[PDB]
Tab-separated table of C-alpha atoms in Angstrom:
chain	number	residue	atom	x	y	z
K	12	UNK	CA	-78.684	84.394	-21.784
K	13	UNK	CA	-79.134	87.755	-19.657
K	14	UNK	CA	-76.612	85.646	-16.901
K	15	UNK	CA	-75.285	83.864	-19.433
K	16	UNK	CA	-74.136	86.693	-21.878
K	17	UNK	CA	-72.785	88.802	-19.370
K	18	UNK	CA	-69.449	88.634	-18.645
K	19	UNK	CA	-66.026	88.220	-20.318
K	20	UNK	CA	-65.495	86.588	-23.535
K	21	UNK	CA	-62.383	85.535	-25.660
K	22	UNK	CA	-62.068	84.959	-29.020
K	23	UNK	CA	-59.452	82.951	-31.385
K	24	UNK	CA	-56.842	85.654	-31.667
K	25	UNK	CA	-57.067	86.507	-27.871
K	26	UNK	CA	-58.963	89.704	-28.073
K	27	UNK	CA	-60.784	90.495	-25.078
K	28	UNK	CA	-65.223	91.427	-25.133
K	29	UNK	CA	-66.221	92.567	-22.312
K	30	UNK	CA	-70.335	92.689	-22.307
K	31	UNK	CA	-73.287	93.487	-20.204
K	32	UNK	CA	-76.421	92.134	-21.618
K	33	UNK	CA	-79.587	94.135	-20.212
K	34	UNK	CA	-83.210	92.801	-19.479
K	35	UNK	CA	-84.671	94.774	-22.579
K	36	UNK	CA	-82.106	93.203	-24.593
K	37	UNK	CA	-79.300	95.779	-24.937
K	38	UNK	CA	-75.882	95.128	-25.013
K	39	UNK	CA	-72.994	97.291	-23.447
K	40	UNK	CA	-69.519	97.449	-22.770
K	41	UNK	CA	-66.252	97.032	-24.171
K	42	UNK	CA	-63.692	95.600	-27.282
K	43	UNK	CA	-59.518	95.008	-27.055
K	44	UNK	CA	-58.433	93.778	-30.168
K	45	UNK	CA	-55.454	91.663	-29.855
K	46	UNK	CA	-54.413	92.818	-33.740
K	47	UNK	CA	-54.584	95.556	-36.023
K	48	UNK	CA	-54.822	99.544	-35.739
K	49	UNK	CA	-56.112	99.280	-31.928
K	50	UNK	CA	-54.984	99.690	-28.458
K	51	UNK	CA	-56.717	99.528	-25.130
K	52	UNK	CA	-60.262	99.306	-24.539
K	53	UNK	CA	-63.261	100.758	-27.189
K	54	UNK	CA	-66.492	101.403	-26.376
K	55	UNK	CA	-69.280	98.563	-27.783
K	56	UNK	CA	-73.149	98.592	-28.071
K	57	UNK	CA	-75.544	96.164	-29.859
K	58	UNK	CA	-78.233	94.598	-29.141
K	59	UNK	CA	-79.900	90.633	-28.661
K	60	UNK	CA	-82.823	88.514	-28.570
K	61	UNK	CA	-83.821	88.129	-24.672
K	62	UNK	CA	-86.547	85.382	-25.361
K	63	UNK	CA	-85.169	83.105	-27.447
K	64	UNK	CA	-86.289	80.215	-29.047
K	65	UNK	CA	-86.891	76.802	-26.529
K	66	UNK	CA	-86.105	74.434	-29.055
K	67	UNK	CA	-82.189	74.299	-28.667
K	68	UNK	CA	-81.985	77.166	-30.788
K	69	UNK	CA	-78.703	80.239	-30.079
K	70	UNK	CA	-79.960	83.538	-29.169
K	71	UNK	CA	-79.423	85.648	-31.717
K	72	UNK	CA	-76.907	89.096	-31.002
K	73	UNK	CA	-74.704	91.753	-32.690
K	74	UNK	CA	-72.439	94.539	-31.851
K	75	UNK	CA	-70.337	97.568	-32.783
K	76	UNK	CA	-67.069	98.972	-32.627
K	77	UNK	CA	-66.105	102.159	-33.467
K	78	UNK	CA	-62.044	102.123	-33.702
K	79	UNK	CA	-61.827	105.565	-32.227
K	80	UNK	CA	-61.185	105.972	-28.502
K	81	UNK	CA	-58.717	108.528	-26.503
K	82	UNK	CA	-55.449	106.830	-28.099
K	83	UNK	CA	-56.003	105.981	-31.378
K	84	UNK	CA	-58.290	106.624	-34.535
K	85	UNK	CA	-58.452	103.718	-37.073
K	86	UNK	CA	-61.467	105.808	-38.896
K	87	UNK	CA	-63.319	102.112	-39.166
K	88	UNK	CA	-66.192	99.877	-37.674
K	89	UNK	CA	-66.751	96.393	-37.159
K	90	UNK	CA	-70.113	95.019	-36.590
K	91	UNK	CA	-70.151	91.047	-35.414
K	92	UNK	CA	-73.677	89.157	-36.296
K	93	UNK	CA	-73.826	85.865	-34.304
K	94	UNK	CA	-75.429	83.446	-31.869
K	95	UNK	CA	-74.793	82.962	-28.388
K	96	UNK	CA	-74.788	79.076	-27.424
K	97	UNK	CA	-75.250	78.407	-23.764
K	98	UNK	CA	-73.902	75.016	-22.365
K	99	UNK	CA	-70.495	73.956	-20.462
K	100	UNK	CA	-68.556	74.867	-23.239
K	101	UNK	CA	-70.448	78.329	-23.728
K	102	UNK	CA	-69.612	80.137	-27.052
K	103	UNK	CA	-70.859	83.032	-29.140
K	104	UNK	CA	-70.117	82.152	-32.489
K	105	UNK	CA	-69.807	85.147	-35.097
K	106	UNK	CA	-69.229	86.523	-38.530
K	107	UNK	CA	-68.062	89.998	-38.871
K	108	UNK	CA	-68.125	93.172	-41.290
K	109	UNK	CA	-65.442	95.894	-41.072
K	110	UNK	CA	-65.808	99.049	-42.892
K	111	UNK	CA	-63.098	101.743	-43.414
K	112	UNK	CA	-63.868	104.981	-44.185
K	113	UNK	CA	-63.031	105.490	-47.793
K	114	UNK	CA	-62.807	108.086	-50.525
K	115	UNK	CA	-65.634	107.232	-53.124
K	116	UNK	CA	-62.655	105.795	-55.669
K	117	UNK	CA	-62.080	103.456	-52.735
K	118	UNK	CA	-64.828	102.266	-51.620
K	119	UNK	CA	-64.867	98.796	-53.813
K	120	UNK	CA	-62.288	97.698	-51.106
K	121	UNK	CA	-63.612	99.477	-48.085
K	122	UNK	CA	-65.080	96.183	-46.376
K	123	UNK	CA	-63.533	93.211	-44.405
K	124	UNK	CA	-65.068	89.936	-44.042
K	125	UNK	CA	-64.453	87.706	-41.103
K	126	UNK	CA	-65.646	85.067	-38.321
K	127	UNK	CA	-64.844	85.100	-34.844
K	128	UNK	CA	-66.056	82.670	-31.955
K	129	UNK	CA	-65.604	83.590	-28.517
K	130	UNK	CA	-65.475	81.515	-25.522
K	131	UNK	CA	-65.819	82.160	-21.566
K	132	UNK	CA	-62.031	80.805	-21.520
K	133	UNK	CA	-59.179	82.471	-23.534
K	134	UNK	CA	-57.196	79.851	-25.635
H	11	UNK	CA	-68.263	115.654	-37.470
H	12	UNK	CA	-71.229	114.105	-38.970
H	13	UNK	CA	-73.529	114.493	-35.533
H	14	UNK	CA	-75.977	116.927	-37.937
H	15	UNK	CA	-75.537	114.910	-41.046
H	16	UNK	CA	-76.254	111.786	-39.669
H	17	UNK	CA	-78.677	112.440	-37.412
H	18	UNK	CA	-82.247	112.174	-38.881
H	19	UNK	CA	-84.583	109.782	-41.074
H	20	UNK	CA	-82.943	107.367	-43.570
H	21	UNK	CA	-84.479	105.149	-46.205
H	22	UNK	CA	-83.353	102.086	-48.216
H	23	UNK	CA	-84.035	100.668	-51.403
H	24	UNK	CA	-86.301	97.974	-50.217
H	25	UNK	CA	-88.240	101.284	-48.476
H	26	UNK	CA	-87.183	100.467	-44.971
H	27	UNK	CA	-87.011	103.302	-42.511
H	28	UNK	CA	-83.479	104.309	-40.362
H	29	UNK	CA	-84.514	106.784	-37.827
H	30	UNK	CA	-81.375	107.509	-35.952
H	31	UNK	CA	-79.611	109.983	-33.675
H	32	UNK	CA	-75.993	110.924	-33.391
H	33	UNK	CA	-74.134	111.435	-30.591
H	34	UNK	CA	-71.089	113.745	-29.738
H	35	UNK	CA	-69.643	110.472	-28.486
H	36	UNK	CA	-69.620	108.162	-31.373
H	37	UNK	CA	-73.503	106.535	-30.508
H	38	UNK	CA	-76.036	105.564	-32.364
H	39	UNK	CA	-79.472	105.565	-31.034
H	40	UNK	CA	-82.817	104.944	-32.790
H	41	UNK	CA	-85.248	102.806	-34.695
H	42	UNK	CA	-85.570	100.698	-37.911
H	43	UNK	CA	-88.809	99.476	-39.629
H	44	UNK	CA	-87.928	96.858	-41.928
H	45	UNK	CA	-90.093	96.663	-45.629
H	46	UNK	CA	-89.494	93.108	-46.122
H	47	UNK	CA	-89.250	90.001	-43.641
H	48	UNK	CA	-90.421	88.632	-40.005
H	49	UNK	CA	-91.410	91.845	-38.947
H	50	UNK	CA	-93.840	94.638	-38.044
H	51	UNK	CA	-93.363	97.930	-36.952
H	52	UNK	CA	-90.053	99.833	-34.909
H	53	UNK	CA	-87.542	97.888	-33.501
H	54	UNK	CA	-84.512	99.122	-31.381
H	55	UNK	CA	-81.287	99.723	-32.564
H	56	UNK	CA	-78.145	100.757	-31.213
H	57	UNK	CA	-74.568	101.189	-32.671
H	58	UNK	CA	-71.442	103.415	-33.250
H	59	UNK	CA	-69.924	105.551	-35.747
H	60	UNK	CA	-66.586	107.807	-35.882
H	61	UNK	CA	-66.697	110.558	-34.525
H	62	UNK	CA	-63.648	112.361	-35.668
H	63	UNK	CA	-63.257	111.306	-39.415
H	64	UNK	CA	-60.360	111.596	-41.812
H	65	UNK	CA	-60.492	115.375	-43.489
H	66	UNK	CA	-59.478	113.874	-46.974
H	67	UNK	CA	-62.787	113.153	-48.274
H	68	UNK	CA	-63.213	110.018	-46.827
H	69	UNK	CA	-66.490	108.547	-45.504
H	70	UNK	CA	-67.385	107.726	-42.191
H	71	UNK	CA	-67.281	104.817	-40.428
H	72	UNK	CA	-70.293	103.324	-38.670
H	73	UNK	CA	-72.415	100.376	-37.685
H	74	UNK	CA	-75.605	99.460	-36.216
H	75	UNK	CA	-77.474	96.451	-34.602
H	76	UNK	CA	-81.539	95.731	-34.519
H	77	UNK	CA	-82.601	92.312	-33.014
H	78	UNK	CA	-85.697	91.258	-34.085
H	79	UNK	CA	-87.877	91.287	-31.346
H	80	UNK	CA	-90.830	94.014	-30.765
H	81	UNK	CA	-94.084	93.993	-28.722
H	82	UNK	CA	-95.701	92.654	-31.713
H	83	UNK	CA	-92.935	89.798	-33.213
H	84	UNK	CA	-89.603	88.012	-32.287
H	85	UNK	CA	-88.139	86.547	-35.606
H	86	UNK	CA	-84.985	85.243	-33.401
H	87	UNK	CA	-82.640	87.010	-35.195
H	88	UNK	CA	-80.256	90.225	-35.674
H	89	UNK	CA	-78.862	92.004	-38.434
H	90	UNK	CA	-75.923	93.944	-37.936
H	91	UNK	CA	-75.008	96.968	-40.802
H	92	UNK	CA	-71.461	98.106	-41.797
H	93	UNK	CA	-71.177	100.981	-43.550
H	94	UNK	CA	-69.886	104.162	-44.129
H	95	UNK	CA	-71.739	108.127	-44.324
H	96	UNK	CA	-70.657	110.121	-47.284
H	97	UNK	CA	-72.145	113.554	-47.350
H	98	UNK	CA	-73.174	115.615	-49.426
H	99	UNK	CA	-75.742	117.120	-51.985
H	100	UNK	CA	-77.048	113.208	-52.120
H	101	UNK	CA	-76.049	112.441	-49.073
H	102	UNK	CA	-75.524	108.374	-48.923
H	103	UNK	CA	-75.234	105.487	-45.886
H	104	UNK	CA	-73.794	102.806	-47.831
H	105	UNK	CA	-74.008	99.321	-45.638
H	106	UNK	CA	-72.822	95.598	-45.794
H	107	UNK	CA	-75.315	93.456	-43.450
H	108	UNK	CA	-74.870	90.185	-42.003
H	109	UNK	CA	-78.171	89.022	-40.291
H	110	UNK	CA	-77.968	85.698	-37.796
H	111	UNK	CA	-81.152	83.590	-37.259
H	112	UNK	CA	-80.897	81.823	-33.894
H	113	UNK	CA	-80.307	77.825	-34.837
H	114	UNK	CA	-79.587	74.867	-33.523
H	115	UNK	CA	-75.773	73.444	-33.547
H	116	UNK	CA	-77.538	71.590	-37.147
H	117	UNK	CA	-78.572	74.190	-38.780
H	118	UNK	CA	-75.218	76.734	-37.966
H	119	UNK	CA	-73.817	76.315	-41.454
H	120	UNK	CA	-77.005	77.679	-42.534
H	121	UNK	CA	-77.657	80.763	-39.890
H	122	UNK	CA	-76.205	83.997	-41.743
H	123	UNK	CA	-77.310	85.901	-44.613
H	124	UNK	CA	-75.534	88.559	-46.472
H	125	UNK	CA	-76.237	91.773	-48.103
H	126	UNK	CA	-75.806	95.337	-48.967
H	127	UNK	CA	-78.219	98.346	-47.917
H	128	UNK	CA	-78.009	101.725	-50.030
H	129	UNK	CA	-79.738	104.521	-47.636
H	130	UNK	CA	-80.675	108.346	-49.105
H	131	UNK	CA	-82.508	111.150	-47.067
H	132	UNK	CA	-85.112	110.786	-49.776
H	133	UNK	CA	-87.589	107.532	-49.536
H	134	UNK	CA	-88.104	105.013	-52.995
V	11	UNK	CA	-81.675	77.640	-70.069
V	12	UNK	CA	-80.080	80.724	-70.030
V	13	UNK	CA	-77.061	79.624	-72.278
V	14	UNK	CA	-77.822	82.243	-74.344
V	15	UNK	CA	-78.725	84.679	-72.322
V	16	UNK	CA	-75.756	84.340	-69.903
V	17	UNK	CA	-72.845	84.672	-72.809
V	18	UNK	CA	-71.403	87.367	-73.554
V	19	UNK	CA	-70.069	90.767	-72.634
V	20	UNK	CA	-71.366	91.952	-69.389
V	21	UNK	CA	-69.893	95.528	-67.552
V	22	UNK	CA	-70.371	96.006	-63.619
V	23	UNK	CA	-70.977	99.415	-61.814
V	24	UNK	CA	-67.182	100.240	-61.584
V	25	UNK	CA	-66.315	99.690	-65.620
V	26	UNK	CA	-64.975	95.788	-65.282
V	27	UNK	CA	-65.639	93.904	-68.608
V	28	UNK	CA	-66.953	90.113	-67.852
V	29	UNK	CA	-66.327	87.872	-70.927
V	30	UNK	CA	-68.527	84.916	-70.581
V	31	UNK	CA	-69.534	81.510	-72.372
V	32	UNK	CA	-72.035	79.409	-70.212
V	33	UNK	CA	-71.953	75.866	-71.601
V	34	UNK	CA	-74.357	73.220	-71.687
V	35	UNK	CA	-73.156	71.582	-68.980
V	36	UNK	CA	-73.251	74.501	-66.598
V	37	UNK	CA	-69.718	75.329	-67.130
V	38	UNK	CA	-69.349	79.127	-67.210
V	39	UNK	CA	-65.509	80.513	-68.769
V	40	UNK	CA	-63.891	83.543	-70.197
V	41	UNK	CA	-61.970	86.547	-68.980
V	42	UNK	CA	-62.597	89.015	-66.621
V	43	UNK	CA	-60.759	92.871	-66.600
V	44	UNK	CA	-60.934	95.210	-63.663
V	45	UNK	CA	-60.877	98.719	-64.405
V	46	UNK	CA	-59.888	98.633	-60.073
V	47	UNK	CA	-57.077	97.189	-58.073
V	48	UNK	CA	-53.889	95.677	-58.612
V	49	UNK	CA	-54.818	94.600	-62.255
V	50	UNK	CA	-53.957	94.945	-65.935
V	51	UNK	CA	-55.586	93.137	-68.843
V	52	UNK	CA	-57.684	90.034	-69.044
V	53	UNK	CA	-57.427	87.432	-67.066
V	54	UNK	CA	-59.078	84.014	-66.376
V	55	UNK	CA	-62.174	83.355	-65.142
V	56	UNK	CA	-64.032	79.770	-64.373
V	57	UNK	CA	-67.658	79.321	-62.579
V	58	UNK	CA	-70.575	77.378	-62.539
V	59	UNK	CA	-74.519	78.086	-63.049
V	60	UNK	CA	-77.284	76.415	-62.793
V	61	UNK	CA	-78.430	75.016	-66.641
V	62	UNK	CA	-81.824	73.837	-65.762
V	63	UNK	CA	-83.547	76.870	-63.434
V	64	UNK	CA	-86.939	77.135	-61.963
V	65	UNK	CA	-89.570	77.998	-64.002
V	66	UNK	CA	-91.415	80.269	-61.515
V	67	UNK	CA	-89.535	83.488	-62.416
V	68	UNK	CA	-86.514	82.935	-60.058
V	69	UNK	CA	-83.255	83.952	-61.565
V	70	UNK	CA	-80.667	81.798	-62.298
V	71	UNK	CA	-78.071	80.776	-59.369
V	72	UNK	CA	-74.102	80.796	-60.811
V	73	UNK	CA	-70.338	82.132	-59.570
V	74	UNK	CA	-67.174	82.225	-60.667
V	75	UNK	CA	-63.300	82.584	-59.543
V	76	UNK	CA	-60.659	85.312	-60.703
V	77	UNK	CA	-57.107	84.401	-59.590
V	78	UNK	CA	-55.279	87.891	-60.357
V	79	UNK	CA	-52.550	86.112	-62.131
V	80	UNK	CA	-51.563	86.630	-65.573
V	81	UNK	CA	-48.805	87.179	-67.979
V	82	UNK	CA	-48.653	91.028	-66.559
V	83	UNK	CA	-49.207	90.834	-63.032
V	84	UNK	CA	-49.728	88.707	-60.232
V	85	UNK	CA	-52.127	90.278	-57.022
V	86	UNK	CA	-51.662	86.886	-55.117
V	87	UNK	CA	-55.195	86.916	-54.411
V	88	UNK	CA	-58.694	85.827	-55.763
V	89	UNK	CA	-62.182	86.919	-56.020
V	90	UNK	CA	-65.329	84.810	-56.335
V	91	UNK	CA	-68.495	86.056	-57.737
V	92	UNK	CA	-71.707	84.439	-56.213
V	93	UNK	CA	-74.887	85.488	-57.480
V	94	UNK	CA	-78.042	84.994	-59.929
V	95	UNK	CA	-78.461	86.094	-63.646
V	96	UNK	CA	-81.812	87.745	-63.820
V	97	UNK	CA	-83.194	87.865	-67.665
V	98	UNK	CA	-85.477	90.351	-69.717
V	99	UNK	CA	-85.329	93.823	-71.274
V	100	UNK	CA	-82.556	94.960	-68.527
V	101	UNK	CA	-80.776	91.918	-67.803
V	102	UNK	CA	-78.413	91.843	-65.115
V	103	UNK	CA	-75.869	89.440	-63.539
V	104	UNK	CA	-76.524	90.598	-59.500
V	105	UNK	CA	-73.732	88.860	-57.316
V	106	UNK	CA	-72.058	89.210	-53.771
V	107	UNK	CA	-68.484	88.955	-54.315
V	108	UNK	CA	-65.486	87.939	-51.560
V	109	UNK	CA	-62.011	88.732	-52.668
V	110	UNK	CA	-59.324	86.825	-50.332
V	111	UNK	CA	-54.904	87.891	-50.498
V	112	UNK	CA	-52.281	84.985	-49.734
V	113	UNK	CA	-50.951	86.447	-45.975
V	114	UNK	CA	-49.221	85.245	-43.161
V	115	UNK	CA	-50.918	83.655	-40.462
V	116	UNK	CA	-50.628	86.880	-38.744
V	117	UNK	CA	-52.200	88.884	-41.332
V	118	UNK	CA	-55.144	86.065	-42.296
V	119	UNK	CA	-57.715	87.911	-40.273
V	120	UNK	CA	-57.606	91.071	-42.562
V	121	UNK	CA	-57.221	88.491	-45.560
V	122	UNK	CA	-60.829	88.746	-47.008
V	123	UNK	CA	-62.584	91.198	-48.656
V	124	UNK	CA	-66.442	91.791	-49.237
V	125	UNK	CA	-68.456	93.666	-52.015
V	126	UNK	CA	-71.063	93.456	-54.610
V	127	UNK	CA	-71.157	93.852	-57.980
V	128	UNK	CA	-73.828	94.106	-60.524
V	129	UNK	CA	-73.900	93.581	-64.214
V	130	UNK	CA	-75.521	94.892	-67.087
V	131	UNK	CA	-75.287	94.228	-70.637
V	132	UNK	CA	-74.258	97.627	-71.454
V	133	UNK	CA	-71.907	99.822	-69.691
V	134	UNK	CA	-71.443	103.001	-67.586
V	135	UNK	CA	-70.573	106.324	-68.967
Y	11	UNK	CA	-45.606	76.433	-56.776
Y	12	UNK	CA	-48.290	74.066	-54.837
Y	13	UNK	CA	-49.893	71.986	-57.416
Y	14	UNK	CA	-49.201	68.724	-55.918
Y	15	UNK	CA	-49.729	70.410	-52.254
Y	16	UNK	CA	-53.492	71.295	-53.604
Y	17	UNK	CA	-53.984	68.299	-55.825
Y	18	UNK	CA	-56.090	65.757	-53.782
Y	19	UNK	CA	-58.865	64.949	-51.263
Y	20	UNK	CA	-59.596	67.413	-48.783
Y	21	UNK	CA	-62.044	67.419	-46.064
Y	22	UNK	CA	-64.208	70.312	-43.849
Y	23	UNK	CA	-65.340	70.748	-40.713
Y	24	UNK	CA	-69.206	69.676	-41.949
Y	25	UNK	CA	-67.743	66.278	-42.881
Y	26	UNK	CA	-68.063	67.410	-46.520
Y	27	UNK	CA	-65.411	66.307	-49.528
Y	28	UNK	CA	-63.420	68.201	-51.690
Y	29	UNK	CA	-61.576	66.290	-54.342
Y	30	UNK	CA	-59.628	68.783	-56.426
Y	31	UNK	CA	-57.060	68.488	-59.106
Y	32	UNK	CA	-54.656	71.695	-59.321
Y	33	UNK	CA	-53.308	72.466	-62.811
Y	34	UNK	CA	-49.912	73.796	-64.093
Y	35	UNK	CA	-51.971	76.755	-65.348
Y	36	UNK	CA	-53.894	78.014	-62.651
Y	37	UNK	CA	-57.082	75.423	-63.062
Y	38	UNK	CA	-58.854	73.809	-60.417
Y	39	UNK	CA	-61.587	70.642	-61.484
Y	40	UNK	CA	-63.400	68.029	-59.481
Y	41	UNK	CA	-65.805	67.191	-57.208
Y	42	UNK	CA	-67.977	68.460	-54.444
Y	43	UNK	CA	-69.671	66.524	-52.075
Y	44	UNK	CA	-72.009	68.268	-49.383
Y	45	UNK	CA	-72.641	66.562	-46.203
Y	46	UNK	CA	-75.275	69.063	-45.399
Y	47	UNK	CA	-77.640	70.884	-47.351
Y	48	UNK	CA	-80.488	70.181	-50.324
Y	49	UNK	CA	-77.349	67.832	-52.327
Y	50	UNK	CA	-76.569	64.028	-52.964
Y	51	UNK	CA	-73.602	62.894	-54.046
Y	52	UNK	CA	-70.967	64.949	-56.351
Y	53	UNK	CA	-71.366	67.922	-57.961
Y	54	UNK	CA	-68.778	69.476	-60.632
Y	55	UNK	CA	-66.927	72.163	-59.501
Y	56	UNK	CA	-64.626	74.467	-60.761
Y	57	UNK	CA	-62.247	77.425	-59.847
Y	58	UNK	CA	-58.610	79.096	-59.807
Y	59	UNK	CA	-55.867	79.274	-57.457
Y	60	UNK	CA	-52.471	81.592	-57.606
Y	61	UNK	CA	-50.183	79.406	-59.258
Y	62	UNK	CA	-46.791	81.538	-58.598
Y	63	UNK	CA	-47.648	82.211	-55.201
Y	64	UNK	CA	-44.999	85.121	-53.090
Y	65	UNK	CA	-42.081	82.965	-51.127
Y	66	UNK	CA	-42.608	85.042	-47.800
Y	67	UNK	CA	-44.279	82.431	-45.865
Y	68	UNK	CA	-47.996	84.060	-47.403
Y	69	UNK	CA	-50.729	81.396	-48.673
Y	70	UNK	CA	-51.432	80.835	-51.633
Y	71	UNK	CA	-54.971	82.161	-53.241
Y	72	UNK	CA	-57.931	80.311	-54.521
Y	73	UNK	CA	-61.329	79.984	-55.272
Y	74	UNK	CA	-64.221	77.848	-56.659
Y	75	UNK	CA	-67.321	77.718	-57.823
Y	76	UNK	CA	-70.147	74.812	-57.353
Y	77	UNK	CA	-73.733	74.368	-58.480
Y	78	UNK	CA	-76.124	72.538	-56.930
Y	79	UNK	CA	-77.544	70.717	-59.830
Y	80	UNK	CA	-76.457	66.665	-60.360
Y	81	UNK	CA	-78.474	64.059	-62.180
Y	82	UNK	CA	-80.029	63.325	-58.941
Y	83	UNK	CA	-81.176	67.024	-57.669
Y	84	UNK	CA	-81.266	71.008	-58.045
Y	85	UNK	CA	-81.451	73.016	-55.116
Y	86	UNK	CA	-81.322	76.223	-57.823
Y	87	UNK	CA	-78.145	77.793	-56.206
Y	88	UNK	CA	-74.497	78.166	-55.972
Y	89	UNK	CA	-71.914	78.197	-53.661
Y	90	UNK	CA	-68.688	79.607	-53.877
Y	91	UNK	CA	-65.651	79.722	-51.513
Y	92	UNK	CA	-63.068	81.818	-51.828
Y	93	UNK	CA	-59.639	81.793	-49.489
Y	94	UNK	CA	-56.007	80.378	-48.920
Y	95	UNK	CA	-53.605	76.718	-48.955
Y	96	UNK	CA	-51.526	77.208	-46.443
Y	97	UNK	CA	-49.338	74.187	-46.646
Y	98	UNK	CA	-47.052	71.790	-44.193
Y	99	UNK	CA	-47.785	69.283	-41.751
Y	100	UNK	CA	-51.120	70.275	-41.472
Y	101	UNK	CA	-51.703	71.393	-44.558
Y	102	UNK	CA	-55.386	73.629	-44.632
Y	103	UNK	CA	-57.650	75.085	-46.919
Y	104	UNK	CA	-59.304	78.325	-44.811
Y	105	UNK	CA	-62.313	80.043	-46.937
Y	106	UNK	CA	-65.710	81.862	-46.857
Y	107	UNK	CA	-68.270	81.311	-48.861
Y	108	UNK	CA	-71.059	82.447	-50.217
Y	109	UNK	CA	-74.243	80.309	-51.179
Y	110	UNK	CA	-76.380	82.240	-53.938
Y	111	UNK	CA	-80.200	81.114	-54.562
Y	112	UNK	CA	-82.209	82.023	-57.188
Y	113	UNK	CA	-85.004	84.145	-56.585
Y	114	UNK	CA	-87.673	85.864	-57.737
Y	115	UNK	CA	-87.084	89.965	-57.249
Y	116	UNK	CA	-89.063	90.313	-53.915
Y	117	UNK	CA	-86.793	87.391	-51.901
Y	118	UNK	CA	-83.539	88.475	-53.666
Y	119	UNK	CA	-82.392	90.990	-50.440
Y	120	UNK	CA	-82.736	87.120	-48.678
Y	121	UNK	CA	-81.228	85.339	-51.348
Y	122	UNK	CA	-77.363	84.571	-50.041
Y	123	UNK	CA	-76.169	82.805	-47.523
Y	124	UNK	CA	-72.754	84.117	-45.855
Y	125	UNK	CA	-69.934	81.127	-44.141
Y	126	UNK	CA	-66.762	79.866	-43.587
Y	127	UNK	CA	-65.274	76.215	-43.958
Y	128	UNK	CA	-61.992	74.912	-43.021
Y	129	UNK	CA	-60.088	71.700	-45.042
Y	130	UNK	CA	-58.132	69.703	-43.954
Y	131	UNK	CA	-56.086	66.360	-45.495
Y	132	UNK	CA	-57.688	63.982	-42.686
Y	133	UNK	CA	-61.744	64.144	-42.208
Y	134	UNK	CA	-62.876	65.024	-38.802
């Protein structure tokens, strides 16, 4: 999954996840959204399980976006929780949190749910 | 700019321990000890946060990763928080979590729990 | 089990009144009103719960569906409640909640909200 | 606006089946049945769904609620999805879910599982 996670990965809307996946199980690089209050690349960190399971099992990984880089502020994070499943068809399949920053009166709505899978290919 | 306000020890309800430091550039660096679950000890985590937040009294915006594998156990699985910073006299990391368990293709429906972590600079 | 305990008037963190009868038969109904969000009055709630829980001091599994539709105002969106009723001196309803708008395909991604509510049988200040 | 369009037998990705009737009020009855999962056979089910839904091309929103108790088992839990009818040639039901058990209070931070299932008219 070290050789296997590394590398460029698209998911369903055609945003781009660019990620290098280090021996001590880090994981580095960067996020282009295809939609919403984003341009360009943003910087990504998060971390995964670099000895997995040998029963068939997905490796187990997450990450974060800040939506703040040098061209736009959406004052937000997303985190993606997921599993990385090696194979021809090779897929890291994901469910994801985004939180806006909020005033206190706000914050009932301050949290997006989603799921996201991401393949070595873009559809 | 939340680098001093976010930077330190956190605690949740379940008395888990955040120990985390902010950097100028939007990282988060640090450990977590988890009260409940597969697991002993610190683990790594790593994530981001907004570093140039709205100046209308809005929270900040942040997120964090820990996979669950130390020197001393591998649960094969990560949690990732959501969340936002609100400072303040009570001070307050409010989170969303998702946490993944490695499974097979079988047992995907089931991989993913959900839940919500309150964290205070002052422990349970 | 928990008929009785379940029915009733229960108040979350934010002010909301739940109005709730849990049948029998596991059938939960009433009328929920959010003091938050594109909402006025009561509106109609349906759910489910589990009428014969375990006896080990587990709480009781249930949820239930707003649609924010009513003779006042329509939202075009839902919210379900999943959670368990937990009995005894403080009792409290503690549930996960995902609240999803009618978009576009465009817009589905940012369709869904997430939250969590909890309930007690008497309210905030 | 799409009673008849919701009205039916609907199908997910899991091979489970939905049968749902859609009422002129807002109601939604029938019957759950779980390919997957501690469940045999139907379960009742209940929920609502947006029954003046906007005309600018948006889906319409629903919800139900199902649980897991039948005169054959009780897994102690609940599941409920929450999401959108989008309707036309391939008509689709897109939700999340989330699947509540009942704990005691030291396994309630575990006790919900977090997912998403797609419906469709035809079973995979």
């Amino acid at each position: 999954d070290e050789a296997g996670i590394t590398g460029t990965w698209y998911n369903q809307l055609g945003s781009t996840f660019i990620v290098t996946a280090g021996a001590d199980g880090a994981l580095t690089g960067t996020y282009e959204s295809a939609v919403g209050n984003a341009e360009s690349r943003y910087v990504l960190t998060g971390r995964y399980d670099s000895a997995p399971a040998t029963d068939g099992s997905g490796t187990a990984l997450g990450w974060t976006v800040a939506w703040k880089n040098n061209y736009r502020n959406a004052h937000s994070a997303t985190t993606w929780s997921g599993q990385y499943v090696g194979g021809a068809e090779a897929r890291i399949n994901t469910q994801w949190l985004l939180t806006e920053g909020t005033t206190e009166a706000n914050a009932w709505h301050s949290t997006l749910v989603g799921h996201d899978t991401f393949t070595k290919v873009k559809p």
